[PDB]
Structures are given as C-alpha cells and as structure tokens.
Amino acid sequence: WGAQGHRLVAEVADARLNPTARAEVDRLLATEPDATLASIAPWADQLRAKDPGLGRRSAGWHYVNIAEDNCHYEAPKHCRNGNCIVEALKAQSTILGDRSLTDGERLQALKFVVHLVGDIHQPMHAGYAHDKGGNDFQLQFGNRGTNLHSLWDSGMLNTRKLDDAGYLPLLQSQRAPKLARQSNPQRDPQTWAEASCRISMQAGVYPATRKIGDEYTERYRPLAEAQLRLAGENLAQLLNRVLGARLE
C-alpha cells in the first residue's frame, strides 16, 4: 500500500489489541519518542528508499510474485535466501516475540511486522513476476497515467479524498471479515500471500482496456477497502498472539 493504506491497517489493528499486547506495543513504541503504531506503519518503505544497506537488502521483503505458479508458494522457488514477504514476515514475527531481545530490537521487528501484514494483503504484492507486481503494467486512470501496482497501492484509495480520520470509520463500518480461529505466525503468511495472489488473478483485476476510470473504481475499490480491513484484523490477531500471552 501507500502510506495511508499502511497507517489505516495499523489504526484498525491498534483498536483490537488485547490489554497484554497493547501494553507491550506501547513499551516498544515508547523507546522512540512520539512513535505510534500508525506513524511506524510506512517506515519500511522509507527504509527501502533512504538506507543503501538494510533498505536495499530488505526491498524483496515487501512482495512475493507467485501468480505464474497459480498462487502456489514454494520457498526454494520464490524465496531461496528468504528475501520475500512470506519468509520475512515469519522471521520478524519470531524476532518480535523474543523476550530475550532489547526493546530497540523488538521495536524494529514491530515496524517490519506492521508494514508487511499490510503489504501481504495488497493483491499486487503477490502477483506476476512478469510485470513486477503490475509496476510494468502501465494504464490510464481518468485523465492521468499510472500503473496497476500504484492503482492498488493508493490510486483507488485516493479517490475517497479522506484523511485517516475520515477513512478509518468507513473501514470499521464494513461487515466483519471471517478470520482464521487462531493466529499461526509461521503458517499464515503463506496463506495470506496465496489469498492476495488469487485476487490479482480474478477476472477483470487486469483490465482488457488501456483506459479505465469510474467503472473499475466502483468494482475494485470495495475489494481494496475489504483487504485494508482484513489486513488490520489479521495484524491485531497476530500481535495479540505474539505479544498477548506469557502464562504457562
């Protein structure tokens, strides 16, 4: 997603935190003055843009292109050295849950987990290697050029012309999505990447015309918005599992 989609995922999640996970999240955020779950949600994209070390190393962690394999993820094929969103989200979830680590180390893992639960729910982040997740699929949206990747990251969301205070209660108003009964931090990333890939392959998501506008927005903006709400509920369930339990 763009920066607003990332913040909205975090905002949906923050409201659903159990008291134990909320206390631990606030403890980690407090190590970075005035940080919130929303303000850190875009951080991994600015790290990618600005840090020639970890930023360059982590660029692959934002996606996994599995549509040419009909949305059947296989790590040795799509992800050999672990540089894809499925393996990165698994590892950063393990690091976040590691109570032996410093609050600074665990905040860094929280920043990756908040971002990548957002990205793994963006259909074009699990799409075709051929066109780099739609980045190479140029199209005209209204009287402006864009690409299919950007259209899903932010183009359709921007048509609401809402700041987060306007957009968040619209996402919260939707019918509740059906979640898995429990978070499995090691298995759910693959399930989520596959589900996002199946949306990228749905009839009409790749349009049959170079020029699109209101009809595309009317059909697919609700799907993008359903995916933000789903991402937020899935992020809260993950944080509630990873940070929410200690007894026994």
Ligand SMILES: Nc1ccn([C@@H]2O[C@H](COP(=O)(O)O)[C@@H](O)[C@H]2O)c(=O)n1
């Ligand atoms: N042409 C582009 C495309 C994306 N971007 C950045 O990448 C972000 C999206 O990253 P993800 O695809 O990982 O979500 C945008 O919010 C923006 O900051 C950019 O800065 N210039």
Ligand SMILES: [Zn+2]
């Ligand atoms: Zn994103």
Ligand SMILES: [Zn+2]
């Ligand atoms: Zn993107």
Ligand SMILES: [Zn+2]
């Ligand atoms: Zn990203």
